[PDB]
RNA sequence: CUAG
């Protein structure tokens, strides 16, 4: 009874964060990311994630699979792109849009956040369009990013959350 | 990217 209420997701790190919407063409890659703690983006996006990674303590990546009408969670970018990381043999069609280098992520919160529920939120960095209209690695104006992440934390954990925590712990035993 |  001395034990604090134990938690099943990681809270949004405190401090000065930047926020990017990350898009996947398919669930398979997103699920692989969750099992392995790894992502890779399009080559053209790598310098901008590295610029964010160098600039602030936490780069928060809010994921959404194309066409699912939902956000699926948020991760912290935990390594700079460049440098061997490993994992992630990714699915893609006839070699097109071939992905860049794998980097580490830590899944903070996994859930299914409907776009309906984000419909009053717009992003000044993308012409004040609703945040659902976000290409891969579009930056969220940071006050809007913090609002969008806060909506994620209102949703119940999806089944992937515990999958993530388990995989994360397994990688920790070294 | 969102919509079909």
From Swiss-Prot:
Annotated tissue distribution: Expressed in seedlings, roots, leaves, siliques, stems and flowers.
Conditions for induction: Isoform 2 is up-regulated by exposure to the oxidative agent methyl viologen (MV).
Residues annotated as domain YTH: 17-152
Gene ablation phenotype (knockout): In oxt6, small plants, especially at temperatures above 22 degrees Celsius. Enhanced tolerance to oxidative stress associated with elevated constitutive expression of genes that encode proteins containing thioredoxin- and glutaredoxin- related domains. Altered poly(A) site choice. Suppresses cell death in lesion-mimic mutants (e.g. mips1, lsd1, mkk4, cpr5, and cat2). Enhanced sensitivity to virulent Pseudomonas syringae pv tomato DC3000 (Pst).
Subcellular location: Nucleus; Cytoplasm
Biased composition (Polar residues): 1-11
Top-level taxon: Eukaryota
Protein role: Component of the cleavage and polyadenylation specificity factor (CPSF) complex that play a key role in pre-mRNA 3'-end formation. May interact with poly(A) polymerase and other factors to bring about cleavage and poly(A) addition. Mediates poly(A) site selection. Binds RNA in a calcium-dependent manner. Exhibits endonuclease activity with an ability to nick and degrade linear as well as circular single-stranded RNA that leaves RNA 3' ends with hydroxyl groups, thus mediating processing of the pre-mRNA as a prelude to the polyadenylation.
Subunit structure: Component of the cleavage and polyadenylation specificity factor (CPSF) complex. Can form homodimers. Binds to calmodulin. Forms a complex with cleavage and polyadenylation specificity factor (CPSF) subunits CPSF73-I, CPSF73-II, CPSF100, CPSF160, CFIS2, FIPS3, FIPS5, PAPS2, PAPS3, CLPS3, PCFS1, PCFS4, CSTF50 and CSTF77.
Family: Belongs to the CPSF4/YTH1 family.
Protein name in UniProt: 30-kDa cleavage and polyadenylation specificity factor 30
Encoding gene per record: CPSF30
């Amino acid at each position: 009874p001395a034990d604090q209420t134990n938690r099943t997701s990681h809270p949004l790190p405190q401090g000065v964060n930047r926020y990017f919407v990350v898009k996947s063409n398919n669930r398979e890659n997103f699920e692989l990311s969750v099992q392995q703690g790894v992502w890779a983006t399009q080559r053209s996006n790598e310098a901008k994630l590295n610029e964010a990674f160098d600039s602030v303590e936490n780069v928060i990546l809010i994921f959404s699979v194309n066409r699912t009408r939902h956000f699926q969670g948020c991760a912290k970018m935990t390594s700079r792109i460049g440098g061997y990381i490993g994992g992630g043999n990714w699915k893609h069609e006839h070699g097109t849009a071939q992905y860049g280098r794998n980097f580490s992520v830590k899944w903070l919160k996994l859930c299914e956040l409907s776009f309906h529920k984000t419909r009053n939120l717009r992003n000044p960095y993308n012409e004040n369009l609703p945040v659902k209209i976000s290409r891969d690695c579009q930056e969220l104006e940071p006050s809007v990013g913090e609002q969008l992440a806060s909506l994620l934390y209102l949703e119940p954990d999806s089944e992937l959350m515990a999958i993530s925590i388990a995989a994360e712990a397994k990688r920790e035993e070294e």
